[PDB]
């Protein structure tokens, strides 16, 4: 999840 909230950054 962390992951791929940072890409949405």
């Given at each position: 999840?962390?992951?791929?909230?940072l890409?949405?950054?």
């Amino acid at each position: 999840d962390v992951d791929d909230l940072l890409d949405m950054i």
